[PDB]
Amino acid sequence: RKPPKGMFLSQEDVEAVSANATAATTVLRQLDMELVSVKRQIQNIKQTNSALKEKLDGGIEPYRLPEVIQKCNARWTTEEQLLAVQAIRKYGRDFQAISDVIGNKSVVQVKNFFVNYRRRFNIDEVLQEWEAE
């Protein structure tokens, strides 16, 4: 009902190998070629990504900045208020980025800010200006 284990025989397979007198060496010799071209295609890309690893010598260690470990406050000094309105203009509703800029406010009171100070800082208009970007 099934071939011995470790033996591969397919109805499909046998006709292609038997169809002419040389169909065996022909079928076999495409695959030696298909193997050698993939092999040379490997050593190609193996050398292109060699180059790109050298363009990345040292990673980005010099360009890194130290962590700003800053306890989260709750009151809104005018300074952190004006930083806010500018981030809204640069970041839309990504309130994580905006919470990162201002530093000492968590993502919820950024949401809260959007509503309490919504009238006075005229946030609606700012967001429309950001949309045009």
Binding site: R1, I60, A97
Partner: protein, 666 residues
Amino acid sequence: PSGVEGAAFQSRLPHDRMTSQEAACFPDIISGPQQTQKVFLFIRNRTLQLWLDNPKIQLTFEATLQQLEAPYNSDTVLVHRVHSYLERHGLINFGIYKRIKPLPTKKTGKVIIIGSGVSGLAAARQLQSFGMDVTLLEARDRVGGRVATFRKGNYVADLGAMVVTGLGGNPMAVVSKQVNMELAKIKQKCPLYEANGQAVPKEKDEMVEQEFNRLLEATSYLSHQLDFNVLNNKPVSLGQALEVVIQLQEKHVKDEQIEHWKKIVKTQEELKELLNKMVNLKEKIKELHQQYKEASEVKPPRDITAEFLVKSKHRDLTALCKEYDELAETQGKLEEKLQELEANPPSDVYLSSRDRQILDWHFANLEFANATPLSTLSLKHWDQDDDFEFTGSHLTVRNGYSCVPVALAEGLDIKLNTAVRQVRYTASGCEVIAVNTRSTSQTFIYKCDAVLCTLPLGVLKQQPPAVQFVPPLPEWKTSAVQRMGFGNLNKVVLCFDRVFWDPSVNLFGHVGSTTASRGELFLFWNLYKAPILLALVAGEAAGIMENISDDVIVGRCLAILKGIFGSSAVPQPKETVVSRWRADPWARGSYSYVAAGSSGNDYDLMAQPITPGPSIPGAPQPIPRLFFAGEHTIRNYPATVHGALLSGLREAGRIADQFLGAMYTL
């Protein structure tokens, strides 16, 4: 098996149902009540037992019925019918037995037997014990046919048959109790040896062997599951099928390699796309760093847009610094995967050049068994007789297998050096025309009621005919003759003055440097008491080594043996015999094989007797006159001695039924 049941088995009979042949002789019993069939079967098996348990004395019907018990011995005609059926068809009282009843003073009918091979001899002994007058015509100066045995001094070696294939159901078991035969078991340990001269490593032998066995099953799969039995309007041979299996394994290796490296590219490129992401991101991080740095250069106090711009670039830069770190994990997660894949690659080849040379040895062994190159064996049928294999070890005959025919010939009218040239068969009888092989001018004419041809198939195949049939054989017969296969297989007997090989191995192998010569001196046998090695020439090598002189052949044997045992342990041989069975005009081969395009049915065609036409037109349909036997005529046990013998036993019965009547069918 044991009991009356073991007797049925040891006579190739099922204990629990009746054969077609008993159905023919006992149609009353078969079609009758299930209980009566059972009584018959016990009577058969019990009588078979009584014979087998002692085959050096005739088993008389009276002796039979006395060891029987009620209710089995209540019916004497059933017992007398069964015993006579068994006697007539050579299941009991065959071979060399002492006759309780001396044979009738005067004989009935006259049979000429062409050939005193084992099949001829077995028929002649049966017919003569049935009360017929029997003469055998033998072209050679000796009996035995293809059972040839070399004898010089105490050197003894078989040039023909030498192996008894296991006593479980084998009539040669009976013959062995009858004629003393020093039967020695064959140890199946066969150490192989490369052309370099050194042994094959034990891991390698077992790989290649098992691949050989797996390759065979695969052809079977091709044959019975994929109906790949005709290709280009021609029947597929075994060898064709093996190539196609080998090529598909070779193909599937290449398919695995391609699929492997095709994963390597599909990740090297997923890496490439990752590194181009990390160049173009590091160059953004260069640029934001400069920008953040300049913005940090504007000294405080700063208006709020300038403070936003520091704090903004700082967020933006740590953001890109995180994408570059996440990517550097993904870079790390692809780098080891490439290392893992590269270090677990699939198999480089299917079989190395050394591998395929050891596999070619196993193919030579198989070409040996079937006495022909595998490109001639029918893929569908080459193994049609494996179901009737006997149980037990194979054996050899230390004292020479000629002792069997020589013994059968005791008491028989045999005309040696008598070659048949024409066989004439007509409605009233037959006349066989033979010459003397020494001087061919002397001509003899033998007249008889029936001829039993046991001419080897290679002789019947000969064009132009060695033997002429008058009238010619019908097309259905001559076509079976053309379709069948007659193979070829030779031996080199090497006679030394001292043992220089391992005495504990019966047989050892030589691996050929090429496929074409895979059969050339590929195997050696230590079967005898005296220092004799015996070397086989199988496959396509058999027919070609026959145009090579003895000395050149014995040279190549010594060469191969030097490489095994060192150039100084091999003496020059004292005696050397080289067989050439395809050259032998009374053989013209070694034995039959199921050719591609043929089938087991041809073996039954070969066995059908010939009935001549009527002498006077409108006269009644005559008797059959020309009968056939020998190894090429027994479907289930072709190409062996036990099969030859069985075919003689069966023609004797068929001929006796025809010419003495068969009173046991009422």
